[PDB]
Structure 1
Amino acid sequence: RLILAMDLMNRDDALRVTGEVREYIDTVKIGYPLVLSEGMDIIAEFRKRFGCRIIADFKVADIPETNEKICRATFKAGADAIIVHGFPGADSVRACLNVAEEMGREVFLLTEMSHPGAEMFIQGAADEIARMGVDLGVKNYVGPSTRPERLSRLREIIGQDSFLISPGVGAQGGDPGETLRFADAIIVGRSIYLADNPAAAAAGIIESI
């Protein structure tokens, strides 16, 4: 129930830390901090080297036509799933779902975000974004560890069968145990990758739950 957010920017460090904590995870979330620094080939390298599933956290948030192109390039690169913003609307999300269907991959819909600024505009639209996901057939979602009451409401909307992962654990203030009352898995970045001993940090999280 632990997903590593590998946001280190250099390949050697990213490979070192991921290898050190492999026994505690099975899924690695790779985003733009690593991809824009080392290239899209890093996805296939990780997939092969560690045998872990890769979620490409690209927060896709463009018009339908561009979203289609982004998803196609991402799945061609070997990603198992891609995270997509729901705020740009149903057509933009559907474009991602269509490419995922064509390529036998998955889409994760980001509903409410975990940082303070999410309260400004995203929070007020989050319940509706989650309902839109349900209506579009989305089965994978992302919700905030920093607001468990919101994570609870989001879980209520998507149902128990939907898969929900949650970032904001550790560095941002979220708690592993409380978050897992509602989410199926927690995403952890800095608490593990900036630790003096990443494996010890990961093991500690796995034990606390």
Structure 2
Amino acid sequence: RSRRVDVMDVMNRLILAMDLMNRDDALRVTGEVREYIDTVKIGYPLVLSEGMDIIAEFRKRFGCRIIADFKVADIPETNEKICRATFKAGADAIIVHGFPGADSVRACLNVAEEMGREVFLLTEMSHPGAEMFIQGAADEIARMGVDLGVKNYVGPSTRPERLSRLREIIGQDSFLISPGETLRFADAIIVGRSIYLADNPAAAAAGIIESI
């Protein structure tokens, strides 16, 4: 897929899921692979353990974009506050669940529009438990996002036919990232453990990129 001008440009189409919970380790390993990526996804284990100031620290030390994987899933008023605090801390984007409904998603979109940031809608998950309720709601959640003008989506990380289906629903221009061919549908892939748990993180990242 060619890059679209109106959505984020992710270097090498590779997003590092920096899931380590210790600040020293997270910054050290990210430093080891800084030449391979310019976009890093950070979640709650690291931020709750080390403080939200870690977001700005990554942006300054590496010049990277930060996507806050906070899977926002509260009522509208609370979602608004979570997004505002996250963007105030410097996050370029935030990942939000769609199962709590349209008004909960809209609350996040309102803050992102006000602050000049982005919202990613999580349309589906791939852990086994996702089959109970998430899988059956995925197409409807993706359509809800499209209907509200969402332009960034996070999709499944195990089944290709699921990607083409999500791509079909969201259209050819919206931005789609997928954890884990894939780049024929998704605009970027997210890789974590395969890189940060590797004996040689740099080698792991370089291997993945050359393959891309």
- Supply the distance in 2 between the matched residues of 1:184 and 1:120 (Cα, whole angstroms): 28
Find the aligned partners of 2:156 and 2:36 in 1 and give their Cα distance: 22
Could you list the per-position Cα deviations for residues 114-145 of structure 1 after superposition, in whole angstroms to 9, with x for gaps in the alignment?
Answer: 21211111111100100000000000000012
Deviations 1:22-71 (A, max 9, x none): 11111000111110111100000000000000000000000001000100
Can you list the C-alpha shifts for 1:73-107, whole angstroms capped at 9, x where unaligned?
00000000000000110000000000101111100
The 2-side partners of 1:49 and 1:208 are apart by: 27
CA RMSD of aligned residues (A): 1.1
CA offset digits 1:145-166 (Å, max 9, x no partner)? 2121111100100011000001
Q: What is the Cα deviation at residue 192 of structure 1?
A: 0.4
Contact 1:177 1:208 survives alignment (8 Å): no
CA deviation profile, 1:160-197 (whole Å, cap 9, x unmatched): 1000001xxxxxxxxx9922121100001101000011
TM-score by length of 1: 0.94
Q: Which has the bigger relative contact order, CA under 8 A and spacing at least 6?
A: 2
**Distance (whole Å) between structure 1 residues aligned to residue 160 and residue 74 of structure 2:** 29
Q: Which runs of 5+ in 1 are unaligned?
A: 167-175
Q: What are structure 2's unaligned runs of at least 5 residues?
A: 1-12
Query: Whole-Å Cα distance in 1 between the matches of residues 55 and 117 of structure 2?
Result: 15
Equivalent position SS for 2:34: helix
Percent same amino acid among aligned pairs? 100
In structure 2, C-alpha distance between the alignment counterparts of 1:11 and 1:24, rounded to whole Å: 20
Rounded Cα–Cα distance in structure 2 between residues aligned with 1:17 and 1:114: 26
Runs of 4+ in 1 over 4 A off after TM superposition: none
Which one is further off, 177-186 or 43-52? 177-186
Q: Is 1:115 aligned to residue 127 of structure 2?
A: yes
- Partner Cα distance (1:11, 1:202) in 2: 20
**Deviation of the 1:109 alpha carbon:** 0.2
3-state SS of 2:95 partner: strand
Distance of 2:196 and 2:85 partners within structure 1 = 27
Query: 8 Å contact 2:157–2:180 — kept in the other structure?
Result: no
